[PDB]
Amino acid sequence: AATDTVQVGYRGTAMEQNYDHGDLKTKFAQVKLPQSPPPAGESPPGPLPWKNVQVLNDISIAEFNRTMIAMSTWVAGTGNCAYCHNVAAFQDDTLPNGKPLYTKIVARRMLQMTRNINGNYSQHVKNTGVTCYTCHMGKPLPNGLWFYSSQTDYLRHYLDRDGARVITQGVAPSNANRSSTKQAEWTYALMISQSRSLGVNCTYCHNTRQFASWREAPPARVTAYHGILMLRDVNQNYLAPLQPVYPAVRLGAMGDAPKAQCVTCHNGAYKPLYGAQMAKDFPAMWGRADWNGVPFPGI
């Protein structure tokens, strides 16, 4: 029944995070115990034999096989190469029946997406980075999948919408800001969702005496903003265009593809996997010329 607290702002401002100590320990142990361990890695010479490899062109043959073992355990359970492949012919993108191996052609896109996350959105994911495990956590479906439902659904802030500001940056009313109180309710609903997605409260990113202030806010607010821009790219360019690839059992009632949100990576924790650093161990997924000064072992 003890409560852990973390101070995140100045003395006396009550910018604090509170956790039920028992509840947090069970959540944390529930991550530790399943956390999948990595293979060791090794450094051969020699030219690449692959017949139909289009993304992983740039890694050694040993690093490639090491990556496939990781992908199996992170998405399908360990050694489950049959989840993606016609195991008699790994280069195939179709079954013997000619029907396409939809998971393999999705997984090729998910590699490009992961490289794009780890490369272009380092202002968000920094040197923790993401792997397939971050979303999938050992299962084919991540958490927090969402579909079209209503026009005013706030999760469209992570796809095709842009503005969320409502506060005036001046004393007097002006034509610059004609925001409705209903729009402030909409931002408030959106912000509760982000708070729950991380398991934090509003004071993690704001001094609530002025929500619009960046100077009074913790630096996490700047990281959070880059998370919005990242999700828009992830949803608009990688997840949403996979609509013709999935079986109709995966699609939404509008026939749209499942889309991601903050909770998909974070799963109610302030960092994904409480900050477990795995991307550093898998250069196939860096999308980056060095990871924290460790250079990419390219061929």
């Binding site: 034509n175 004609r178 409705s180 209903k182």
Partner: protein, 71 residues
């Protein structure tokens, strides 16, 4: 039937009657004024052939927007 005024005091009945007719007329006028087909203050001059029909969809307008430009 005039004996209704022996059991009920007409002083009290007429206030309740006036109030009931008042709320009923006001409800119906406000209902119509909010409809598409019978918004007579905006569209009263349209002919019946060009007045709205079938506009029963429960979200005809955008729910969320800025206020109109403030001038």
């Amino acid at each position: 039937m005039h004996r209704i005024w022996l059991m009920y005091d007409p002083r009290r009945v007429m206030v309740a009657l006036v109030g009931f007719l008042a709320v009923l007329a006001l409800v119906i006028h406000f209902v119509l004024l909010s409809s598409q087909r019978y918004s007579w203050i905006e569209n009263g001059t349209l002919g019946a052939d060009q007045a709205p029909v079938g506009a029963s969809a429960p979200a005809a307008a955008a729910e969320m927007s800025p206020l109109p430009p403030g001038r």
